[PDB]
RNA sequence: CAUCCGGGUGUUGUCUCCAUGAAACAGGUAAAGCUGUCCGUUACUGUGGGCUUGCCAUUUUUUGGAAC
């Protein structure tokens, strides 16, 4: 029961290899699912098994069924709005 | 330390821009406002600020169902670097 | 009003300025202070904007600009495009 | 694990795809060199607009602020 | 380096074109290390097609009017100002005069 | 630092960039205003049917936070 | 410089923010920072379209602030001397 | 309650010593460093002096989520 620094939470994503979903900065229409495997002081993140998930315009749900595989990507931290587990 | 940037400009990505400057060949610069600049780089810095000669600026307007290819000539120009998207070597 | 060609912002304290912002509005008021970020303090500031209904008149004239009286106002420097002198100090 | 700068330094002389923030434009080509700021230089690079190839470009430089992600290509 | 070169364009008739499309013609009186530019006897202009595309350039035309220099109701949007100070981040390009000996300034 | 001490372990609603809203228990923060949320939920409109539970840990990047409201 | 000192001198007065999103918050300034991060209390929020909502507290990231209107009695605070 | 031996400050005059590009002429004022008038210097660049203490592209400002 303490302050958890955001960088240490990203490191917990890295260490426990927990899949994450990433909300992009101004692209409200797509998100990225994958596993974080490295980062830096700017929140640039290297993601393993990246898949680009379309987001329904009206419902707001994630269309996992037609997501696009990408592989290992370096998602530039200036493009990240939110990183969440599962 | 200036001897550091001397190396990053000889061996990092901006080496391409440096070769363009040294060999005086033109380059094609894509800008954030959808304009293309075909010009000779006279000077540059780490921001991709550039001083250019023989600038030829190309862009396309839209008037509904048709487009017009506009074009300009500038003898010499300063370009602020944050507008640069891609600098392409002319083959 | 005509001002000296060597004038910097440091000289324009107590002058009335029109300060133009990136969203299309203008702020008119006596400059009290400025900052390295170009943050500005305008005393007795008024904001003017051109409503979208009246914007068609500006295309290739009398424009009915909407005003808000703000008072003492801090403008954040990143929002500023440019500044113009309107009037000299008293 | 692999941090962003070592990962991108390991992609040198390999094919990468540089998706951009804007215009749905992705450049696919062999990564030549990289800056601390993640400016990029590609040889043999070629432009894709909305998944449609626009022909090869050659040797290009991409300024760091235009890049969305750099993906390794198989 | 290159802004320290722009510091040498004093008293030359630059044209500064901003990122919103507004074009500023005038005598360059001073430049900051951050490219904040001070100009006198300025003539603000907007390209004619910019004015026609009202939706995409309404902010630029509104600002050009709200500078207060748009006295004549001419066929083109023109503003006349004795003095203007431009925040440097908004500058996109600067046309330099042809006679300028760049080799002597870039040292 | 952002003086967010007041908000720790309380519920907050963050208005983030892109007209998005996220509610969660503030688990911690950063010089950049990055925040960690417990029990995070995406907010879409008024109807709870359109709200979506996010996950156990959610990190929000500080420049994406427009504002936050105490709850 | 002075604009940030003026904002820290507005602490405890009613101030009105407008944001880059266009929203307006009027409330009592609780705290301020060199970033212009501000906390407001007992706040009236005007949506850009005209909707009015009341909130007990709001924290606003300083980068998202467009301008801050402070009381005019600050015009002769010692910081300007 | 007085006297007496002394003291400070301000203003004006006087006395001594030393000085004396413009001290002419006219008005005004208690008087003048007031007005007409006269003399020199200065505006641009260089060097020097004084001040600021800026330099000493990575999330909150200025090296662009913009453009359509």
Q: What does this protein look like?
A:
The structure is cut from a larger assembly and holds seven protein chains of seven kinds. Chain A is mostly beta strands. In chain A, 13% of the residues lie in helices and 45% in strands. Chain A contains one helix and five strands. Chain A has a five-stranded antiparallel beta sheet. In chain A, strand 2 (30-39) and strand 3 (45-54) form a beta hairpin. The longest helix of chain A has 11 residues, at 6-16. The N and C termini of chain B lie far apart (34 Å). The radius of gyration of chain B is 15 Å and the shape is elongated. Chain C has one domain (9-85): SH3 type barrels (Roll). Chain C has no helices and five strands. In chain C, 0% of the residues lie in helices and 48% in strands. Chain F is mostly beta strands. Chain F has a single domain, classed as SH3 type barrels. In chain F, strands 4-3-2-1-5 form a five-stranded antiparallel beta sheet, with no helix packed on it. Chain F is globular, with a radius of gyration of 11 Å. Chain C binds chain E through residues 1-3, 5-9, 18, 20, 22-26, 38, 48-50, 52, 55-56, 58-61, 63, 65, 77-78, 80-86, and chain E through 18, 20, 27, 29-30, 36, 38, 40, 48, 51-52, 54, 58-63, 65-69, 73, 75-77, 81-87, 89-90. Chain B binds one RNA strand of 68 nucleotides through residues 32-34, 45-49, 62, 80-84. Chain A: One of its GO terms (biological process) is 7-methylguanosine cap hypermethylation. Chain A: One of its GO terms (cellular component) is U4 snRNP. Chain A: Belongs to the snRNP Sm proteins family. Chain A: Keywords: Cytoplasm, mRNA processing, mRNA splicing, Nucleus, Ribonucleoprotein, RNA-binding, Spliceosome. Chain A: This is Small nuclear ribonucleoprotein E.
The H/E string of chain C reads EEEEE
Strand arrangement, major sheet of chain C: 4-3-2-1-5
Strand content bin of chain C: over 45%
CATH topology of chain E: SH3 type barrels
Measure the end-to-end span of chain C: 13 Å
CATH class of chain E: Mainly Beta
The protein's oligomeric status is part of a larger assembly
Which structural class should the secondary elements of chain E be placed in? alpha+beta
How many H/I helical runs of chain C?
A: 0
Taken in chain order, the helices and strands of chain E follow as HEEEHHEEH
**Most extensive interface, chain pair and sizes:** C-E, 37 and 36 residues
In total, how many domains does the architecture of chain C comprise? Answer: 1
Q: What would you report as the Rg of chain E, rounded to the nearest angstrom? A: 14 Å
* C-alpha end-to-end distance of chain E: 10 Å
Shape of chain C: globular
CATH class of chain C: Mainly Beta
Number of helices of chain E: 4
CATH architecture of chain E: Roll
Query: What portion of residues of chain E belong to β-strands?
Result: 35-45%
Strands across the major sheet of chain E, in which order? 4-3-2-1-5
Main location (chain D): nucleus
Organism (chain D): Saccharomyces cerevisiae (strain ATCC 204508 / S288c) (Baker's yeast)
GO molecular function, one term (chain D): splicing factor binding
Function (chain D): Plays a role in pre-mRNA splicing as a core component of the spliceosomal U1, U2, U4 and U5 small nuclear ribonucleoproteins (snRNPs), the building blocks of the spliceosome.
